[PDB]
Design an enzyme around this catalytic site. Structure first.
Site, PDB file in Angstrom:
ATOM      1  N   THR A 151      43.192  41.897  11.957  1.00 27.62           N
ATOM      2  CA  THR A 151      43.453  40.477  12.188  1.00 27.62           C
ATOM      3  C   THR A 151      42.934  39.980  13.521  1.00 27.62           C
ATOM      4  OG1 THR A 151      45.588  40.741  13.208  1.00 27.62           O
ATOM      5  CG2 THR A 151      45.574  40.585  10.784  1.00 27.62           C
ATOM      6  N   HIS A 189      45.495  40.823  24.841  1.00 30.72           N
ATOM      7  CA  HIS A 189      45.726  40.155  23.574  1.00 30.72           C
ATOM      8  C   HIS A 189      47.112  40.447  23.020  1.00 30.72           C
ATOM      9  CE1 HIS A 189      41.348  39.437  23.519  1.00 30.72           C
ATOM     10  NE2 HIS A 189      41.159  40.746  23.578  1.00 30.72           N
ATOM     11  N   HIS A 218      52.994  45.547  13.831  1.00 29.07           N
ATOM     12  CA  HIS A 218      51.938  46.263  13.135  1.00 29.07           C
ATOM     13  C   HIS A 218      51.905  47.717  13.626  1.00 29.07           C
ATOM     14  CE1 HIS A 218      49.670  42.311  12.328  1.00 29.07           C
ATOM     15  NE2 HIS A 218      50.642  42.536  11.456  1.00 29.07           N
ATOM     16  N   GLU A 237      51.761  36.704  11.455  1.00 31.69           N
ATOM     17  CA  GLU A 237      50.423  36.595  10.921  1.00 31.69           C
ATOM     18  C   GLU A 237      50.473  36.385   9.403  1.00 31.69           C
ATOM     19  OE1 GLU A 237      47.991  39.746  12.898  1.00 31.69           O
ATOM     20  OE2 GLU A 237      47.397  37.906  13.978  1.00 31.69           O
ATOM     21  N   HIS A 258      52.599  40.620  17.206  1.00 30.93           N
ATOM     22  CA  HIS A 258      52.116  39.252  17.364  1.00 30.93           C
ATOM     23  C   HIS A 258      53.343  38.347  17.375  1.00 30.93           C
ATOM     24  CE1 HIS A 258      48.029  40.638  16.154  1.00 30.93           C
ATOM     25  NE2 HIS A 258      48.732  41.531  15.506  1.00 30.93           N
ATOM     26  N   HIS A 294      51.807  47.452  17.826  1.00 28.57           N
ATOM     27  CA  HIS A 294      51.810  46.275  18.638  1.00 28.57           C
ATOM     28  C   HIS A 294      52.464  45.136  17.834  1.00 28.57           C
ATOM     29  CE1 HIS A 294      48.277  45.929  16.120  1.00 28.57           C
ATOM     30  NE2 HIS A 294      48.573  44.639  16.079  1.00 28.57           N
TER      31      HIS A 294
END
Ligand SMILES: NS(=O)(=O)c1ccc(C(=O)NCc2cccc(O)c2)cc1
Ligand SMILES: NS(=O)(=O)c1ccc(C(=O)NCc2cccc(O)c2)cc1
Ligand SMILES: NS(=O)(=O)c1ccc(C(=O)NCc2cccc(O)c2)cc1
Ligand SMILES: [Zn+2]
Length: 258
Positions: A196, A62, A117, A104, A94, A92
């Site tokens: 999230t 992911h 994050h 996000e 996104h 990590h």
């Protein structure tokens, strides 16, 4: 099958196995800068990462996580909206398929190219697993990424990504200093929210920095070469691994700055 970010397993489907997806304090949210209110009750924020001990980097299918030793107060977050001490466990990102998307949280509906994050757990609960059973178990420091100049402190991360292309791959990642991922200013917005990703647990105090870091187009391009899939499986580029903004519901976003 499992949750993910595709048409058939993405954010619109998550509620069927994780009904909290429709809950009262879900993340991310849009940060309406005009409606956020300066909060004089907030204490100064303290990011204390000088003794951080990174261990490993993992492609979990992911995102990729850089994991830290959290068996002592080595890398902690305190102050701001927080009561007590929160220990860094992993960070990590996104990110998007295109520079116009990937974050996000949004700021007045603006999407950034990516979002970092830094995940911390409240030491009063002893272990991460117990912290995720508490309404104040976690604190996530979120940092926006825009494309421009390179982030030198990100390059070591970029360069290891070739070792962890596919899901389930890991690589030793010691001696990484996460202070090299921060902007100059610690001004922030804060609100109570959730993970999230599934299981979407409502345990997070979000602290979202106002100042984005810049990264180069070559740095993000390398994020986009990762794969969601395992080795030998059909190649699916790891892009657009972000959840869109969720209803604010009965929440107020507070600002640390006037
Ligand atoms: N956990 S979840 O509710 O998000 C969820 C669970 C199962 C499924 C699922 O069965 N999807 C079918 C499917 C088909 C093709 C590719 C996929 O990734 C998933 C979707 C979402
Ligand atoms: N032992 S350690 O401090 O390096 C460490 C352990 C777990 C984690 C972590 O990210 N845990 C959450 C989690 C939950 C389920 C599956 C995972 O791969 C990770 C991070 C660091
Ligand atoms: N994107 S986020 O920072 O909100 C985020 C941080 C951590 C995690 C995480 O640790 N997930 C694994 C996990 C957590 C609680 C219970 C589980 O079974 C698995 C997920 C999302
Ligand atoms: Zn995240």
């Amino acid at each position: 099958h499992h949750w993910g970010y595709g048409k058939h397993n993405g954010p619109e489907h998550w509620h069927k196995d994780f009904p909290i997806a429709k809950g009262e304090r879900q993340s991310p949210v849009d940060i309406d800068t005009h409606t956020a209110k300066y909060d004089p009750s907030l204490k100064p924020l303290s990011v204390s990462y000088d003794q951080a001990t990174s261990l490993r980097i993992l492609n979990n299918g992911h995102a990729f996580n850089v994991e830290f030793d959290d068996s002592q107060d080595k890398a902690v977050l305190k102050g701001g909206p927080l009561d007590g001490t929160y220990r860094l466990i992993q960070f990590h990102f996104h990110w998007g398929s295109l520079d116009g998307q990937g974050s996000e949280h949004t700021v007045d509906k603006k999407k950034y190219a990516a979002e970092l994050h830094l995940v911390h757990w409240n030491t009063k609960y002893g272990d991460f697993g117990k912290a995720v059973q508490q309404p104040d178990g976690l604190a996530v420091l979120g940092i926006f990424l825009k494309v421009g100049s390179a982030k030198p402190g990100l390059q070591k991360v970029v360069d290891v990504l070739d070792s962890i292309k596919t899901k389930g791959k890991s690589a030793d990642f010691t001696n990484f200093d996460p202070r090299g991922l921060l902007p100059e200013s610690l001004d922030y917005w804060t609100y109570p929210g959730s993970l999230t990703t599934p299981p979407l647990l409502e345990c997070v105090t979000w602290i979202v920095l106002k100042e984005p870091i810049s990264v180069s187009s070559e740095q993000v391009l390398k994020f986009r070469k990762l794969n969601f899939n395992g080795e030998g499986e059909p190649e699916e580029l790891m892009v657009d691994n972000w959840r869109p903004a969720q209803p604010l519901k009965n929440r107020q976003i507070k600002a640390s700055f006037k």
